[PDB]
Amino acid sequence: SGFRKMAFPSGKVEGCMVQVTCGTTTLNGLWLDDVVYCPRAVICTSEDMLNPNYEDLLIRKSNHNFLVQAGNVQLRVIGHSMQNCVLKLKVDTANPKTPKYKFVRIQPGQTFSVLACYNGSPSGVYQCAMRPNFTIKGSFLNGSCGSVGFNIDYDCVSFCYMHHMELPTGVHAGTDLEGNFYGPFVDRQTAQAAGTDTTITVNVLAWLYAAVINGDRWFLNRFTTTLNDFNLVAMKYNYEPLTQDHVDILGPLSAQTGIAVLDMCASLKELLQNGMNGRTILGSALLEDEFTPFDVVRQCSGVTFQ
Amino acid sequence: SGFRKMAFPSGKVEGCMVQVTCGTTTLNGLWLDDVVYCPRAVICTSEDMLNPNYEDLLIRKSNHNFLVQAGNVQLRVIGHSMQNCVLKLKVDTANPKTPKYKFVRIQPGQTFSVLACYNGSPSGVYQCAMRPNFTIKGSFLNGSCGSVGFNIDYDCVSFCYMHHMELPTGVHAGTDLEGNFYGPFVDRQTAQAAGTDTTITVNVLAWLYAAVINGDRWFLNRFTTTLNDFNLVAMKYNYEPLTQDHVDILGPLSAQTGIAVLDMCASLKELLQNGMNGRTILGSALLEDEFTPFDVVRQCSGVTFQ
């Protein structure tokens, strides 16, 4: 029983975090095999970050302009290249702690664990969702650039995020491990801001199922709705439209609880129209949207507290 | 910016988790140096758990009745003894991944990270607080017994919790690493239940400071209160009394934000009397009490967004 915002165990990623310094700029890198991946902004002075030409800045650098430290050992950079917004620093030592890994780009509405790191030293781990507007509501301070987000499946680490910057609203923006930004953001100093966001409806429904699995049903009702009728209410409350694929994804949770997906939609519609009336669901007074159907299935018992 | 329920990086603990089997019962153990620590309930059949005499059950066991597996390697048990509610299985191999560690018992109101584990394999990591009633609101399924809770300070792992059982309300109970239960609970099948709980007032105040540090002040007011006048309101809302030591602990947060502790108490008093009026604080619609002053200082910038 219980339901928590649960991250994946971070050890496999901890063994990959290093410190990268170029000039007076220091940030985190990811050491996999004989390559260290880090944000290309490491080559910029704060003067440069306003209007940087990264190709022009990088051609003026040599391998020995890059200082990479893994704990107490200094790794020798033997090559360097830029791929989109990341630098790839080839080093003379392959990381003996390299896990099985993939570079995967995630979809808005999906979740991942973040290992917050400073000066190559891991500080904390937490769960995040990619927002519909391609920002993440992370927790990051100066020095966290290059921290990574990931999921783990059968000892294989799927890296999906590298942290780059904080936006004026305090939310965060970054790239996949190929250096391609999530959303309309750039690694330069501009007035860029997060666009309008929405609530991840399929995740809210999954979380309502999580509450039922743990033995709570107070928000349920005898009503049902059509997919079209629910989406008309969802649009009014800034919720994303629900698709038939979303209904199919919620199938296993619907079967375990005996509550049809469109029946749970009727419950959500009532919760949106009436609020919670002083009550809580899984310890929250808001409708939580940062748990995917997979997250619920992974954490909740396979047997419902009937 | 941002504020998340952030756990410590779990790698140092992952390298210590093993599987312990005795008869048909399997759970998790903690392998430090040449000793494996696990709940003594591993020696019980489910028949035994109603009224077990553990000394009588243990004397009937030999070293070879205990099967310990660390990944794929089986460790040979060369000794065994019981200390309170934990078993200590001496093995013939010292764990080469043993971190610097301590066995510390925590106080109600303090926080720790939990590495949820099943069959000796870590599954997830999350933050928990020890409740005033000595339960934890964890997330645990069958097979999680022996999972541990910990804090990390300068590469030293302070182990503070080993998981034992789930109570009828879905909350969790366990011991320190010396096998002594937190709270009035026992490792046998009884009608035991969680006692009445309260809200951790000092943590709520710390969390309000965290909100101010990140740039939010909507809940503040021009009023102040005396420590006695606040505690009269705290008692009515099932909040713990605030001590002068608590005020002293909040000193650094009060100085960083320029908000006197008794001024923040006035804000909390108003929030308790009037609710939030549809507004949120740090993404929550409830007053959060599972962040300590230390947790806030560790995660928040040292500079307040003025």
Author numbering:
A (entry chain A), B (entry chain A): 1 to 306
Report text from the authors:
Mpro is a cysteine protease that cleaves at no less than 11 sites on the replicase polyproteins. Initially, Mpro releases itself from the polyproteins through autocleavage. Then the mature Mpro forms a functional homodimer and transcleaves pp1a and pp1ab. Given its essential role in the viral life cycle and the absence of closely related homologs in the human genome, Mpro is considered an attractive target for anti-CoV drug development (12–14).
The complex structure is similar to that of the mutant alone with an rmsd of 0.259 Å for all Cα atoms. The substrate binding pocket in the complex structure is slightly expanded compared with that in the apo mutant structure.
